[PDB]
Design a binder for this molecule. Structure first.
Ligand SMILES: O=C(O)COc1ccc(Cl)cc1Cl
Ligand SMILES: O=C(O)COc1ccc(Cl)cc1Cl
Ligand SMILES: [Ca+2]
Ligand SMILES: [Ca+2]
Ligand SMILES: [Ca+2]
Ligand SMILES: [Ca+2]
Ligand SMILES: [Cl-]
Ligand SMILES: [Cl-]
Ligand SMILES: [Cl-]
Ligand SMILES: [Cl-]
Ligand SMILES: [Cl-]
Ligand SMILES: [Cl-]
Ligand SMILES: [Cl-]
Ligand SMILES: [Cl-]
Ligand SMILES: [Mn+2]
Ligand SMILES: [Mn+2]
Ligand SMILES: [Mn+2]
Ligand SMILES: [Mn+2]
Lengths: 235, 235, 232, 232
């Protein structure tokens, strides 16, 4: 199976598999059953921003999701990712729908990774504030598409604009990322994305995640719905 | 009194005032008596590197000090600096000597502060990899000088190069820094400096600190030696 | 007198002192009579963006001003700024009104200077604060609670006032060149909103680089854009 | 054929194909016969640094190569690279030897591309890894355990070999221009160590920008620097 570290924006409470009974942000270490969650008020049709932060000194993976009116949710988890991730990874965004559905629109995405030693460094930084129709530095998987409106649609949307159910899609940056290296004194990464989740359903579902995977990661078969395109099962 | 948050590279164990019985790196929140320390092997005459990291999501102030042979010490402390620091600060480097002495030479210093909200930001970044004789964007205090060798000598050195006792000096960046702001979702800062501590004494003393202070901070009277130019007393 | 290098966004043609007969962007080296200009269609009430670029290798000072519909004006001038500026400088934004007027609202400003062989300064304001401790405000310039920097005076009911001048300078001096550096470069970007109900908007906005102790020259409202004591 | 824009650090004068009669730095636009050159004193066994700078406003491609004693050579060429390069590219380093030889050791490489109206790519290698998954190595190029990138072949006892050619390309394609961008800029820096015990060092190192599927052209050792199929 793939190795997955992720931050989930989980719009649907699947209490059968350990979700809390409300929409939530979560930290996922090799399981869709978050090691840590926090209550999250997803604002239907509003543009939200997620920030994800980690470094090898503090060994704490932190995330905050916020909307323009000021409401925010935060979750942190203490973990040494050196003991979890392979040395080389790809980084990506994933989203899904199931019996319920929502747009999983990404308006922007930035990422920075640094390996530091004895000086004021190896580094990778990319930022997309507009996506292109043929975005050659992104690997799209599943239902994910980039449009001429400058956005990344992780899950399927109809020609009339409406989201579709039982959809799953992901976008990974093209280059592998050197996420740790034994001679480095500091390894850090940061990610930010902005998103627009909109639904006319009885309940929106399923959510968006930022994830870090093995370089050859692919969408697990059957990972629509509650598995967020990240995991083959709810274990 | 000034308000001080600092990371100390403490070369002399002052066990009377709560130092551990070995050289150490420490996190100082409004007291020279560190809230958290870790054992540190200072390598006499070698160039070391210190990295300091904080963000308002994880609320953990982390530091690591390392030398070219690979040895490193790390300390982290959980603290919400919003409840400690004023909104506007200056950032700086400080060092002292006492009855024992050492060179407190800074070879480079970088700093980044960011205030983020709902997007992929206000920011300040500076880096000095060489200091100038007349370094107009630095406020020097006490015995601190910049040379034509490209370094910052925080404490006094004789014409023959040898360090002097009972010395104290500091360098602050000229512009005030907006270290937190209530509408920001993320406030983060990072600092890195490289240093060369060298001594022929029976024991080196006293150490170097990176600090964040009120904008009008000055060297407390009598803060040579164990007080590291940061504090008026050992309380 | 001060030493001034500036990029001007000149909304009012003063053909009396060398302006072309249209609004224009210009490169100003120690005089308000631009060394190089390009025609500029200022879009009243729209948010524009100015990008300014220089490096000591190419020794070209370049600027472009653009609006969201894509219309843009560009101007470039070959100059070795080592021969013009003091080693240490301050960097700033300036604007003026005169007999005609406009808002000179800055929504964001960023700046980067590097000396490589690296020393570097970078700041970004995407929202300004009411009491902006790392800005030196001169003349009529204020920062509000709307996150913007108003370079010239605006009345309580929101409207711009005439014969106004104001500037904002970054607090720290900047080391703009150093003889041992292989590359000295700088870049600046700002976004602005110029709005006018006048018969003609005037006078404009500039990004400028000055001696560290620069102050608004006496009488520099109107066509002198808060930068120069005279039209020489 | 490939489409190539390059900055060459040319250690061997091939006056037969248009080189000046001295080692030189040159700007190459779709041909090995540089559009612009400048005399260059390569310092055998010393670590040098190359800085390359371009932006779509000034439309000047500039480069400087320098050593720690301060000696430097600079070359600039006015060109609109929108008219030359494909929208998407890969960026890389290339080097060759021929009948004379040298080490073509890269100690560090950084690159930044930005499209503003911002999209951006930045990478920095200050130490290379043995299995460098974000580099595409072509020809004789290898990465070691000493943290360096060896573009041409070196023998087990450390010495450079003749008629060798190798390149390293960053794994991700780069969006080097986009029609809606107001500013498209890129910058690259690399540090290198060219060492030779030969009667003359040869042939040199280049930073280059190519079509995304670029490969070493057949026969491009020696004076063609791994970039071009011929001297046209
Ligand atoms: O922050 C800055 O000053 C530079 O970023 C920008 C520049 C131009 C435009 Cl249109 C939008 C942005 Cl965010
Ligand atoms: O990392 C890079 O590629 C750029 O940084 C440098 C550039 C030139 C020199 Cl001499 C030294 C350094 Cl650290
Ligand atoms: Ca769920
Ligand atoms: Ca002590
Ligand atoms: Ca005018
Ligand atoms: Ca040649
Ligand atoms: Cl369920
Ligand atoms: Cl299952
Ligand atoms: Cl004691
Ligand atoms: Cl005391
Ligand atoms: Cl006139
Ligand atoms: Cl006059
Ligand atoms: Cl020849
Ligand atoms: Cl040929
Ligand atoms: Mn969940
Ligand atoms: Mn101590
Ligand atoms: Mn004019
Ligand atoms: Mn040549």
């Amino acid at each position: 199976a793939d190795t997955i570290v992720a931050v989930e924006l989980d719009t649907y409470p699947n209490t059968d598999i350990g979700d809390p009974s409300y929409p939530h942000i979560g930290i996922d270490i090799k399981s869709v059953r978050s090691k840590k969650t926090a209550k999250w008020n997803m604002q239907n049709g509003k543009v939200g921003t997620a920030h994800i932060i980690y470094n090898s000194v503090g060994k704490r993976l932190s995330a905050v999701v916020s909307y323009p009116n000021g409401d925010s949710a935060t979750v942190s988890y203490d973990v040494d990712l050196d003991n979890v991730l392979p040395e080389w990874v790809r980084v990506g965004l994933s989203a899904s729908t199931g019996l319920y559905k929502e747009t999983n629109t990404i308006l922007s995405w930035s990422f920075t990774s640094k390996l530091k030693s004895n000086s004021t460094t190896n580094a990778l930084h990319f930022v997309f504030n507009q996506f292109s129709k043929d975005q050659k530095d992104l690997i799209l998987q599943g239902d994910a598409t980039t449009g001429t409106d400058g956005n990344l649609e992780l899950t399927r949307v109809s020609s009339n604009g409406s989201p579709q159910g039982s959809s799953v899609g992901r976008a990974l940056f093209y280059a592998p990322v050197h996420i740790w290296e034994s001679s480095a004194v500091v390894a850090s990464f940061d990610a930010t994305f902005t998103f627009l989740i909109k639904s006319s359903d009885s309940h929106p579902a399923d959510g968006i995640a930022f994830f870090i995977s093995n370089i050859d990661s692919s969408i697990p078969s059957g990972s629509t719905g509650r598995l967020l395109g990240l995991f083959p099962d709810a274990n």
